[PDB]
């Protein structure tokens, strides 16, 4: 505790849900600084110590808490999901905004890049594709990973390397849970 | 582990010196809320949600106390082993595609934060901007470090440049992540 | 509508 001697602890509870509540896994992690020393795992069903640092806690924890923790899987995990998640986060549907833009200059023959910006949507599941005259392009195509905005919305940018021509129609097709019908944006020279 | 959904109901972060703490609820990697430990109030990131669910702030205070307790016990046991300083990384990108004169938001995502103490600020052309700024709590990472995001509302102009300034004990000199309407 | 939370267990 002399001068720049920083100390912190972390408690990280986890309710892993698979297929609604058909399967739940409850994990409770006990971290000292950045080191996980103790851990409860519903799969294992017991407070096993992770590292040396957590040697002194196992026995005591399984004594005093084992029963109280196993229960949280129902009173905390299943409960919060069915009683609070269902009406809020699991019901959140924000529709994507979709726009196409060219990376360089508009002229009559350039190896440019079309960018399809898909933004402010929720939840994560989404599908974005490029078409050139009705045929899907997959070769000079790339999309960023899912970008989490931190405000409960995502965005993904999808690039298509191409060479514009006359009467050539490019389309960005987006399918998302919030859209009863897919969105299609068009771009021409 | 894996799943279709992940809930973290009661993340506790307590550090010293300073008795600095944080209590949050996450779902699918997003902040449901954080309990304001001074106001003793649950602060929901999405107001609408608070209309349908709730959480007694006392639960956070009770557990933040246990954080004060377990820490110390562990600071004594670890033979007083201090935390090792990591170096933060920042990325800047707009919420929506940039259009001259149209209201947007600039986002600064700072990752690999450890310990969870940091100052993140915005510079319009090289001058600190303090209005229209919002910051998230500290999100947990798989490796136990943290990320956090800051936001700046702004109007895109040809005569404007931006920088996200991050200050951390793991940097020798404040990091400036530059950004400007391309 | 009242959410629960995982309790952080004390040591010693």
């Amino acid at each position, epitope marked *: 505790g002399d001068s720049e001697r920083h100390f912190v602890v972390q408690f990280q509870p986890f309710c892993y849900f698979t297929n609604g509540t058909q399967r739940i896994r409850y994990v409770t992690r006990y971290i000292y600084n950045r080191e996980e020393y103790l851990r409860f795992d519903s799969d294992v069903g017991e407070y096993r110590a992770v590292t040396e640092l957590g040697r002194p806690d196992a026995e005591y924890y399984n004594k*005093q808490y084992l*029963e*109280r923790t196993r*229960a*949280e899987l*129902d*009173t*905390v995990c299943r*409960y919060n999901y069915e*009683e609070t998640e269902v009406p809020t986060s699991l019901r959140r549907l924000e529709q994507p905004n979709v726009v196409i833009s060219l990376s360089r200059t508009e002229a009559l023959n350039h190896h440019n890049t079309l960018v399809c910006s898909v933004t402010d949507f929720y939840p994560a599941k989404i599908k974005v594709r490029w078409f050139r005259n009705g045929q899907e392009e997959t070769v000079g195509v790339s999309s960023t990973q899912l970008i989490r905005n931190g405000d409960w919305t995502f965005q993904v940018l999808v690039m298509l390397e191409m060479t514009p021509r006359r009467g050539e129609v490019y389309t960005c097709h987006v399918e998302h849970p919030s859209l009863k019908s897919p969105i299609t944006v068009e771009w021409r020279a | 582990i894996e799943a279709d959904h992940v809930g973290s109901y009661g993340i506790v972060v307590y550090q010293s010196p300073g008795d600095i703490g944080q209590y949050t609820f996450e779902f699918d990697g997003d902040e449901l809320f954080y309990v304001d430990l001074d106001k003793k109030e649950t602060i929901w990131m999405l107001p609408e949600f608070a209309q349908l669910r709730s*959480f*007694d702030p*006392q*639960g956070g*205070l*009770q*557990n933040i*106390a*246990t954080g*004060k*307790h377990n820490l110390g016990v562990l600071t004594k046991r670890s033979n007083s082993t201090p935390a090792t300083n990591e170096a933060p990384q920042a990325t800047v990108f707009p919420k929506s595609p940039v259009l001259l004169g149209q209201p947007n938001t600039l986002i600064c995502f700072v990752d690999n934060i450890f310990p969870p103490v940091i100052n993140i600020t915005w510079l319009r052309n090289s001058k600190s901007v303090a209005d229209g700024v919002y910051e998230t709590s500290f999100f947990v990472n798989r490796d136990y470090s943290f990320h956090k995001l800051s936001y700046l509302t702004f109007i895109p102009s040809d005569d404007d440049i931006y920088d996200c300034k991050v200050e951390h004990w793991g940097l020798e000199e404040p990091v400036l992540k530059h950004w400007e309407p391309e | 509508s*009242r*959410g*629960g*939370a995982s*309790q952080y267990r*004390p040591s010693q």
Partner: T-cell receptor, first 111, second 110 residues
Framework: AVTQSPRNKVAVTGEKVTLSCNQT?????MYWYRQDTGHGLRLIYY???????EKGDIPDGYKASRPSQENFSLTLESATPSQTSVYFC????????????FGPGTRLTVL | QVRQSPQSLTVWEGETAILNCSYE??????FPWYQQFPGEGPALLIS?????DKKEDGRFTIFFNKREKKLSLHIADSQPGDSATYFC???????????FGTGTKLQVVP
């Protein structure tokens, strides 16, 4: 193994009564109750125990103080007849799903 | 809040004393019953989790009915010595404090 200062005290309206408690159980949580015919036990003030203090169900007219792990005191800065009862101090683990240990009690009368 | 049906009860040694309790906060997950003998403070007798629906320990058995938010403590084979005031408490899935009830006074006639 919980102790309370006045095991019985009689004061007058307006007086500044101060019941105090002590617990060796080395518990983090401490509570102050009051038993009354028709209400059973009612939490008044409690602590996560450092220099912590939180309002219970009926905190009005009261103020608590937890100067140390084992000391939790209840204070009435202006006694009232409505405060004539039996005060029960208690201690337990951080939590609420944990067993609570009570003291003997304390009868108080203001007049 | 917590409620205890039997405002007061008297039974002759050997029978079965049934106590009742109810609450209406589905978030309640832990319910401990305290026993208080005249002269001293209350003390924890038997506690149950919302997970199960029954808990036994001697003559004492808690009957927990998740829905309808009912709950009851059965003392089979009564006995003078079990005669004080019993308290039904409860706490939520968050870690908040326990909330007791009116409390039933039991008298066991030898």
């Amino acid at each position: 193994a919980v102790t309370q200062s006045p095991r019985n005290k009689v004061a007058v309206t307006g007086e500044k009564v101060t019941l105090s408690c002590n617990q060796t159980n080395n518990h983090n949580n401490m509570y102050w109750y009051r038993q009354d015919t028709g209400h059973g036990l009612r939490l008044i003030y409690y602590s996560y125990g450092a220099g912590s203090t939180e309002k219970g169900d009926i905190p009005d007219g009261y103020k608590a103080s937890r100067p140390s792990q084992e000391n939790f005191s209840l204070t009435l800065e202006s006694a009232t007849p409505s405060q004539t009862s039996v005060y029960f101090c208690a201690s337990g683990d951080a939590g609420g799903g944990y067993e609570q240990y009570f003291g003997p009690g304390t009868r108080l009368t203001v007049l | 809040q917590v409620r205890q049906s039997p405002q007061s009860l008297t039974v002759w040694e050997g029978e079965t004393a049934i106590l009742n309790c109810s609450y209406e906060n589905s978030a309640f997950d832990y319910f401990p019953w305290y026993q208080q003998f005249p002269g001293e403070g209350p003390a924890l007798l038997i506690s149950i989790l919302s997970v199960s629906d029954k808990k036994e320990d001697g003559r004492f058995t808690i009957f927990f009915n998740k829905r309808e938010k009912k709950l009851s403590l059965h003392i089979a084979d009564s006995q003078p010595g079990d005669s004080a005031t019993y308290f039904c408490a409860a706490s939520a899935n968050s870690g908040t404090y326990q909330r007791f009830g009116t409390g039933t006074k039991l008298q066991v006639v030898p």
